[PDB]
Write a structure and sequence with these properties.
Structural class of chain B: mainly beta
Bound molecules: Mezigdomide, zinc ion
Number of strands of chain B: 87
Structural class of chain A: alpha+beta
Pathway (chain B): Protein modification; protein ubiquitination
Protein name (chain B): DNA damage-binding protein 1
Number of strands of chain A: 15
Family (chain B): Belongs to the DDB1 family.
Helix content of chain B: under 10%
Shape of chain A: globular
Oligomer: heterodimer
Pfam families (chain B): Beta-prop_RSE1_1st (PF10433), Beta-prop_RSE1_2nd (PF23726), CPSF_A (PF03178)
Organism (chain B): Homo sapiens (Human)
CATH class of the largest domain in chain A: Mainly Beta
Radius of gyration of chain B: 34 Å
CATH architecture of one domain in chain B: 7 Propeller
Largest interface: A-B, 39 and 59 residues
Amino acid sequence: KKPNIINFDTSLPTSHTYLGADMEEFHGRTLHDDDSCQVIPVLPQVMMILIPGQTLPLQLFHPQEVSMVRNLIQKDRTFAVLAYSNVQEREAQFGTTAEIYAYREEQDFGIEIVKVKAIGRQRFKVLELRTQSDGIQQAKVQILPECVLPSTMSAVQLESLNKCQIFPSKPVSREDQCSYKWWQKYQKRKFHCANLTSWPRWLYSLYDAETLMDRIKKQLREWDENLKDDSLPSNPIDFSYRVAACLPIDDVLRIQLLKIGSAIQRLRCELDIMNKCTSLCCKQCQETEITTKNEIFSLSLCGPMAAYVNPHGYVHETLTVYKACNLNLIGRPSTEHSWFPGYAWTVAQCKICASHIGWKFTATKKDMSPQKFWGLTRSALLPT
Amino acid sequence: MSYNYVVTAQKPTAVNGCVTGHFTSAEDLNLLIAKNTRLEIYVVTAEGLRPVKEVGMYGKIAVMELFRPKGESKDLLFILTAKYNACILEYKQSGESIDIITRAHGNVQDRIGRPSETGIIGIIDPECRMIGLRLYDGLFKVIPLDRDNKELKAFNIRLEELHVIDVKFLYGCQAPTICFVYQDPQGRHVKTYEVSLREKEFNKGPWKQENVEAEASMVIAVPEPFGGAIIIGQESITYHNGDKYLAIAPPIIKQSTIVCHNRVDPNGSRYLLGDMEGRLFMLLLEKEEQMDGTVTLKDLRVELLGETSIAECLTYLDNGVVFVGSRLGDSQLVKLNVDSNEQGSYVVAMETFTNLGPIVDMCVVDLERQGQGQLVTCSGAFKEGSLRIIRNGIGIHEHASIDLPGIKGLWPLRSDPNRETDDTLVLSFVGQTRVLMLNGEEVEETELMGFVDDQQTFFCGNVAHQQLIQITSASVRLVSQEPKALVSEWKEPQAKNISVASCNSSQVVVAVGRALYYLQIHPQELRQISHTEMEHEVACLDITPGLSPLCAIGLWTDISARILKLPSFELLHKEMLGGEIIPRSILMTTFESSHYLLCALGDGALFYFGLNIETGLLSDRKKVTLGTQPTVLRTFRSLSTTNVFACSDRPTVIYSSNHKLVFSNVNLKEVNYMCPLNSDGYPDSLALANNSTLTIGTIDEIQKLHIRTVPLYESPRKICYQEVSQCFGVLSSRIEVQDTSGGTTALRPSASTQALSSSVSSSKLFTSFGEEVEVHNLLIIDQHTFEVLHAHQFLQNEYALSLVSCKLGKDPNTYFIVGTAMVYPEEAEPKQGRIVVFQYSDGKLQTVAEKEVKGAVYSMVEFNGKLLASINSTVRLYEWTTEKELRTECNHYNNIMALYLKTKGDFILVGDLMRSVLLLAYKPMEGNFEEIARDFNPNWMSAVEILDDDNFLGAENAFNLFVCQKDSAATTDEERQHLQEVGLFHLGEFVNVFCHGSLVMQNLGETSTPTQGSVLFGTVNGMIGLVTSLSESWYNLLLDMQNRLNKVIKSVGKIEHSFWRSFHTERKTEPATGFIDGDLIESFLDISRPKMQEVVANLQYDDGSGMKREATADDLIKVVEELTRIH
Ligand SMILES: N#Cc1ccc(N2CCN(Cc3ccc(COc4cccc5c4CN([C@H]4CCC(=O)NC4=O)C5=O)cc3)CC2)c(F)c1
Ligand SMILES: [Zn+2]
């Protein structure tokens, strides 16, 4: 429980200086026409459900994938990441397209190892998984559309009380008696036309966009001390994607939130999960508590969970906890490729099964969080 | 594979905009009202509003204004549709053909754009140079107003302020100038722009940005010579003209915010305001400042006029008459009399225009006539909440009406030689007896020679031997008809006062006190026949033919019908039926081609009975609730055969087909006393004398729907009907302010605070001064008098959601099951609720049972003697144990909140607000639910209903209707588990509730009707619909005839029907499929004969062998009349 002093300058982890510094950057964005079928290459050796807006680092070594990256960059820069189900071996029906923005090629070790960073952009469905003899299979991809709905009172609204539907900004910021009182009048004035329908105002508040985001922000701030507008988007779509990325949930739930096509439904699902979720247990054991619900913080602007690459290319999603339980450390704290600029990782293992639950990030300087940082991964971590 | 047919049984009533101006002609003053898709044009006169036109447009009116460009004699009307169909219309009449021609028309939507949160704004330049539309965020769309712009081509000008609240054109500018209030992170600001048509871009405003109140809502443009604008907030009203500035903060307006306004003076000296809770304010501008001819403002005094209905649109008609247009109440027409001030109110109501919306819940019950439905809705909200009863009735058309000071009785009289034409009518006041002779349309009254001016007349008809008996309390006098002079006058044998006297063609029976006399009719002589005495007081008498074989008598106390020989006192029969009160009136007739005698008591109830033609008495016992007032039964020959009129608080017409006397509720508020009439002006008509006035007219077809109100002065949420108790259980809620004493005081006398017996829930299963808290009640209401018999008040902070009236298990009793939820402002999603089982008996509500559930009970249904409840996202089945305690049987956990539950057999249709329709089946052999089919599509659903075992009907966003069908014959599981969608329609209304039933007589008819089933839906605007099924052949024929009608019928605004009915949504639009527009098919009867022939040329009408390519024209008339008869 370390409050107040959280001095890390929590933006470096979302820059990945471990993965090379002089990283070549790419100008901007792209767009795929909605409800269209395209041909997208699939980069292999990746097994993770990449939520849109989530950064994915990558190290690629094999010649086929390097050449695939090469001809991708010279023709568009988008590939496909498939949301693999519980069954492996190409048992995927949905996925997301990752766009490159950061590139470097290294000739070291007599190899053409490529260090590349991407972020997901769109959401899609695979019709059939076509396989190409080169090794890089291309799928024919159908762009699953994004649904944004109007206000639930827009249909039943009165044409007079319409100029009374632009609220003054939230008073001050993140202050009591400035929220519980502001939100009451906000609900009272926004859903005044709920009297014409057959439902109470609070029911329509359960399907509101601002209200659901506010509840998620409140609970998240209860977990970690967020900086109000600490890169949390105002758009419900982007906020839903960020929260879905940062929730410590199992794979089936991520696939389920990936299936949802509307922001409001996604937010209701996320509240259901994070209100019904208390403990996170070791998947290989399903018997030992390494964590809890209140003990989750963020050194990254992307939240308590982020995607990182070890020097062997494997991708890990890491969760930060103050004081982990039932973990044993082995090895001296070393800092060759620590993903956090200033700490020294020590591998931790389950007290019974001895699985790579994560790392303990001990400090190096003295004006840091002192040896209290467990970056546990998801390979053995099931919500319970 | 749906093939449905949707029709409107009652047009929308809620007003969402009204204007006035010289529209029909430059001399007339017209009031134009848009209710939704309907535009009604009235003419303002001294007596009130005279309707001129009703035109139905192919869209929802979002904006209308009246403008007059140069070179025009009368105003044109610019109407914009909710689908962005702009049009400019012009009134044109030639004697009798009334036409609204379309001057211009065009869609003005944009290919890309999010519609504004504050909605569509439509404004017109006061000099009539341009039309400004704010449809989309950050874009002001401008339509130049030129004679050559007949397609309404428009251009977009960029607005840098994305959040624009209100914008209007200023008055008195050389070039068009707009002024608007917008939102910024720094606060709210007012700004002005100079729109330039040639440059097609804005310019610099005459007066720059000024900071305004943080809650500035409306801008009103003050006309010359003041100029400038007035911005009204929640606490202050400010006037801006650049250098000139005023601001006031009156405390009278702090209670509620102003939402509507309307200028009342052509020079803008006074303005009229209305607020959210419905009170009229009166802004006053003083022009006392005048330096060198310039007129400048000096004060902003605000005055409160009074309290009216909750208004959405105000309008000032001529001579201090204000039309208060309500949308969630009733429209009003009030007077701004400044001298009345009876207790401090400047307003008095003149008229009240009915408004059924918003219909929150509705039910079909057989209140009066078995087989024919009656609709009971839950209309209005806040203080206008009411119960409204909709009924089919035989409306009466009035020919000639002359007001009367509440006549107490009328009788036709003839003062001419016998020619089957009665040109006179003897009235009957309390003690006075006037006679008015009306050969044509005359209303002057002259006293008859044979009767005194004031004698308290009882019977005055046509006496025998060409005479006229004008009876009175003192004596029975008959005056010769042709000589117009008295020939005989027999005094009462007992020398007393005669109360009830009955006269027939040949025999007369007059009763005084407890003794009666029978007198024969003789030429110029009143020859007494006999006399008799009664055991008790003679309440009523009747001798129906001319010597009757029996007489009628009722007792004041015993209240038993006695029948005896006409020429003596020899009794023949008697019978006592209840006898709760004195029998108001008893009469016998042969309307059913058989001898029947009916009695009507003082409570309005009626007891039919049978009688023999020669001699003998039958029982034929039946109880009828005609009304809550005494019923003066009468017979009028100008009918099918005889019929019967039962005048009461709710008048009725009795008519028998073969042996079942059916009731036709006449479409009138009150009739009091009635009579036939055979005058030359109105032959074979009826003269009715209502409490306030009187009329003479005829009857019409059933093409009428009557709405009777029951105000509750609070919002009614849900309604159910209990037959065994003859009662209505209605949920309701009232707003109570939190006073500084720990309690909650009310705001006005509501139906919950004015009940006979009251209760407060007492269960133990588990702020700021000024906050409004909602208090929920279950009211038990009588079905006849509509008086609140009971009012149960629930716990604090408990919201009652649902209500069902049903019997469970083997228990003979019927109960009210109410599902509640404990909601607290701190928490968003309730954690605990309560299922409470009440039982109404002996005029007292007793809590039979309590169950505590963990969640909100959003809905409940009666699933084959087992209560089916939806606690949050879990559907649960309860069994009524023999110990009167609910027990859990089976659960089913969903990922959606089961807001909607509809059952048909063993098929639970489950919904949520996200249009995630799900189907469940309850397998009984194992006792658990199973999922059959699923249809998930992100969209807002308002309602859902099970049409039949395969098709499910629902309403969703952008006022649409849809029909989903499961293919149970599919050989693939993925299609079996999927609900294919087979019907789309743009209804144009927001439907809250679906219910099975029909408002017309349920006749099997052997051959039945092509329409199978009937589902009624209620909308926010107050429009009742009706959807039925059709066969494939009829669907194809009606579709072809619809497509051929679309090329003949010319719509106003030239909106294509295909576009108007196409399934619309903010993201995607599709054509309507599987739905037949009943309004269009029904409008086919109103077209002319050449258009009649143009529509039908190759329809291939016959389907029962052959095609008969001619198809005629009267075959489609027969088909369309058959479709007309279903509602
Ligand atoms: N074909 C082919 C091919 C060609 C070339 C290859 N090269 C081999 C040599 N590699 C250099 C090297 C190796 C070894 C280290 C030690 O670091 C390791 C080792 C193993 C796992 C992890 C770490 C660190 N670490 C976490 C701990 C938590 C934290 O904070 N951060 C982390 O990174 C791990 O999980 C450092 C540098 C470069 C690549 C190749 F591997 C394949
Ligand atoms: Zn373990």
